[model samples]
Target: RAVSAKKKAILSAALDTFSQFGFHGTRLEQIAELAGVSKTNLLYYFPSKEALYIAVLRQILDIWLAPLKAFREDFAPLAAIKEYIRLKLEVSRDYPQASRLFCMEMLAGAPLLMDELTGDLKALIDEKSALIAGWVKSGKLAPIDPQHLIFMIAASTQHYADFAPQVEAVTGATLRDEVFFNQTVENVQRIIIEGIRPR
Candidate 1:
């Protein structure tokens, strides 16, 4: 656990630097400095810049599905999904930089992570898609393409973080505050949950 903690600390430190400055704008020294470690120490853990960034990206990607993973067959779907959206909003508030970093990487065509994205991520979504299919078969949800459903959920919820500047501009308010974020969460859940319920 200690070893993992050190590794995670290094990765998180690297993530913050990359998110703030991006790939071209970043330097190894900056990551090391931010982590309060020497370049030699950082290198001792990760031999290359790409290696560190990739590790950090992979770590984050593994966690991206956590909110959806909370979906439960026995639980009330509406409540479960609302909690999921709330969890996502909480992540947006706490880790906006990390979210932007993931978005930037995807925009760049996932140069370093095409395999992980296509393999692990795609497969995970397929599994969840089957779960949604089951829900539809049980008449728990209106039939909708699972892929598109997830895409809409992701785009709508993450838009708050990914395009926060635009959201702020349109609302004429900052997204960094609690009241606004709570309202956003409530509005999104209502918009989404209501649409999926029986007509």
Candidate 2:
């Protein structure tokens, strides 16, 4: 149990390191230093840097997709979309490092993530896109490309976290500000919901 906890701690630290410095730039020693463990101990849990990086990615990916899993088939279309946007934005605000890590992987052409992207992620998005399509056909949503809509939602919400430095530079305020955060969420929800409303 102690060893398990140590491994989790190492991964958590590695997540922060890898997010700030891409995989090639981050070293096992850095992760060990942040984790408060020796390099040998870190190696004991994860044999190689690549292996540890993958482990970190897998852990964060599960967390990153939790909001998507919460989307309910039975909920009202606009309400559900608004909730999804809210949850996604909240994740951005709370897990900016994880969000930046994902953006880093994507910016690098996703060499390590291609499999998961093609498999689990693609399947989940396909399922949700199908649901959105059904809602559109039934007049519950405006006629829009479901896949594109999903992409837009992801891109917009994630921009707040993935490019947080840029946003802060431009706006002179961080999204961490409570009032700013709520306003951003409301603005995102309004724009997305209004666009997708049944016309």
Candidate 3:
């Protein structure tokens, strides 16, 4: 099925604007300007501001869940975690805007995406958390609270994107480059993994 490129462009622009200014602060005219389309044209494609916001959020969710979609129990726990970290870091590098939008959605209580937050995402995380807990039980990885581990991963990885400017100012680190990213990932992975590892 061929999706409309114009619609996609509008959604992309909305994502960028919302990521920067957030939902309540973002404007339709700003999205239209960024998309290089008239406000009428953008509205024609999305019908309403809420519809446009939802479209952008759906796109963000697809990108955010890409790593989880690749999860395999056959992979070593440490290897699986490293791959997850690598993908998350890449997401932060390539789609920091979308990442921030996600952070904002959570911050705002996910009013628009309540079903997605409480349904699809919650289901997926529950299943994956169980898989992780199984690994702990079998001694494939350290025994720890899977929910706590997942929380740590989410908080640590998303922190780079969510607080980029402040982190950059304090550390004098450039998000535009890879050295700092790799170091951050390494430090986080080591800290969590070492702390949870069975002696």
Candidate 4:
């Protein structure tokens, strides 16, 4: 656990740097410096730049993937989507840097993440979409394209984090406040549920 704390610091520090410079331009020495660990110590854990980069990306992806994994086939459609929206919004507020890094990787065509994205992520998205499709067929939700629903949920929830400055500039409030956070969650849930709920 103690060593893992050091490792966590390294990963966090690595993320701060990688999110800025990206894989091609990042220097391990600087990450090591930012982590306040020696280059030898940094390599002692990660071994190589690609290894560290993948670790950073994988860590963030796992965190992002968690909300989708919360989907349960047996759950009520309204509550399920509601909880999913809240969980995703929480991720945005808690890990904006992680979210930004992920958005960057996607815009760069997921050059490094293509495999994990195709493997675990694709599989999970497929699983959840099927679950949502089941709800649609069973009349729990209005007929809808499951994949597009997922896309809308992701883009809308993540927009708060990905465009935090814009949100603040426009509304003078982001998710940091309790009032705004709960309001954002409820509003997103309402807009989404309004679209998918049975008429």
Candidate 5:
């Protein structure tokens, strides 16, 4: 229990710092201070800054990809798409920092994550796209390209996280308000659900 909490503390601290200063601009000592652990002790958990940065990004991808992995063959594609949007929006609300960090990393071209992106992420995308292609073949889904369908959900839901300040500025609301949160979720799913429905 203690070990896990400490590990999380370091990871969260790294994300906050890395998101702001970025990988090249950040130092392990900064994360150590923010995490309230000594630099020497922090090194006990993560041997180097690169290790911590990768861990932070890894956790975000794990959460983001989970809904996709759960997309089952037998499920209705429309319903499953909505569920995926709901989960992603929930993550954006709850894990905004993680989202922002992931955004920062992607903006910088994922220097440390090239292999993971090309190998693991693409492989997962390919599998899900095939499942979505099945839905299209069954005539339950639109003839939309399955890869672009994933892109749509990713770009939209993550906007709630990465551009939260913009959202608050424009809408004068935050997801912390349950009503606004519900409507945003509903609206996102509604647009995609309708657009993807076979027409």
Candidate 6:
């Protein structure tokens, strides 16, 4: 219990720091200070900064991928897609910092996550894409490139988090506004659903 607690503290601190300052800019000392633990103690939990960063990235991916993974073969494609968009948008609104941290990693070429991306992430997406393809084949959805559809969903939803400041500037409302958020969710669902409905 004690060891787990310490690791949690270090990781929470790392997430905050890394989100603001990318991997290159963040340091162990800053995380140590934020965690209120000595550097030596922090290192004991995570042997090196890179390891800590990777740990944070893994946790972020786990959270981000969970809703999508909930997509089941039994669910209607449109329903699955809509639910995914709702979940992702909620994540953006609630965990903007984590989203920005992921964006930072992407902009930096995902140097540390290349293997994970090409391996586990790729495998998972491929499986989901096949499910989407089956939906398309069955006339449940319009003929669409499943991969591109997934990309669109990710891009559109994550835009709220990746460029939150810009969204707030243009809309004159933060995602905190319940009405605006609900409208945004409905709009996204409508747009995607209408585009893919059998014509």
Clashes of 5: 0
Model 4, residue 100: C-alpha shift (Å): 0.5
Q: Which candidate model has the greater TM-score, 5 or 6?
A: 6
Window of ten residues with lowest summed lDDT in model 6: 190-199
Weakest 10 consecutive residues of candidate 5 by summed lDDT:
190-199
The residue pairs that clash in candidate 6, if any, are none
Looking at model 5, the pairs that clash are: none
Candidate 6 Cα misplacement greater than 4 A, ranges: 196-199
Clashes of 2: 0
Weakest lDDT window of 10 consecutive positions for candidate 2: 190-199
Error of 2 at 168 (Å): 1.0
Q: Could you say which candidate leads in TM-score?
A: 2
Candidate 6, 1-199: lDDT as tens digits: 9888888899999998999988889999999999989999998888998899999999888878876875689888888999999999998888888889988988889898788889988888899999999999999998999899888988999998889789988998877899889988998988888865567
Instruction: Estimate, for each residue in 26-95, the C-alpha lDDT of model 5 and write its tens digit.
Output: 9998998999889988889988887888888888788777878556886788888888888888888888
- Candidate 4 regions exceeding 4 Å error are 196-199
By the lDDT metric, which is better: model 1 or model 6?
Answer: 6
Candidate models: Cα lDDT each: 0.80, 0.89, 0.82, 0.90, 0.86, 0.89
**Higher-TM-score candidate among 4 and 6?**
6
- lDDT for model 4, please: 0.90
Counting clashing residue pairs in each candidate, in order, gives 0, 0, 0, 0, 0, 0
Flag regions of model 1 displaced more than 4 Å. Answer: 1-6, 196-199
Question: Which candidate's lDDT is highest?
Answer: 4
Please give, for residues 39-99, the per-residue lDDT of candidate 1 as tens digits: 8888989999888888888777866867777666666766766787787787788778778
In terms of lDDT, model 6 sits at 0.89
Candidate 6's error at 151, in angstroms?
Answer: 0.3
Predicted structure 5: lDDT: 0.86
Q: lDDT by residue for model 4 over 1-199, one digit each (tens)? A: 9678878989999998987777788899888898888898889899999999999999999999999866896678878888889999999999988988999899999998999988999999999999999999989898999999999999999999989999999989988887999999988988888755567
TM-score for each of the candidates? 0.89, 0.95, 0.92, 0.93, 0.92, 0.94
